[PDB]
Amino acid sequence: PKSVQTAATSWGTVPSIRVYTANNGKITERCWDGKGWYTGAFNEPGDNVSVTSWLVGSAIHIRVYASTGTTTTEWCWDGNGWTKGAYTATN
Ligand SMILES: OC[C@@]1(O)OC[C@@H](O)[C@@H](O)[C@@H]1O
Ligand SMILES: OC[C@@]1(O)OC[C@@H](O)[C@@H](O)[C@@H]1O
Incomplete structure (x- = not known):
């Protein structure tokens, strides 16, 4: 069976969570900062997605790896x- 494909990252103690979904060649983003899920700004093409993130002090940095073909x-x-x-x- 077919399935969308997701990647997830989180930071801090609230926490903040970001979930990326590849679906029909488009990757979109859903966000949690403790008070409901909402749609994030990320929107790029891709059929596969991975993610990692790290803090420097209180500042988050996120890297999303979006793959189409090779x-x-x-x-x-x-x-x-x-x-x-x-x-x-x-x-
Ligand atoms: O506040 C939400 C937001 O700015 O958080 C950082 C990234 O996840 C962005 O894509 C997203 O729109
Ligand atoms: O531009 C930001 C950058 O330098 O951050 C570290 C790595 O993610 C690099 O590939 C990336 O270009």
Whole structure:
């Protein structure tokens, strides 16, 4: 059977949670900061998604790896918007 594909990350003690869903070639984002789920700003093409995040002090940084075909694109959140990162594959 078919299934959407998700990736999740969280930070802090509230916590904040971000869940990324690849569905029909589009990746969207759902967010929790303790008071209900809502739709996040992230919207990029892809059929597979992974994510990692880390804190520097109180500031979150998120990296989303979106794959279409053999091409993986890294998207970066650093507090002020999503930008394309420097990631490229080995071969
Ligand atoms: O406050 C929500 C938000 O700014 O949190 C950080 C990232 O998850 C963004 O995509 C998202 O819109
Ligand atoms: O632009 C932000 C950046 O430098 O952050 C660290 C890595 O995620 C890099 O690929 C990325 O380009």
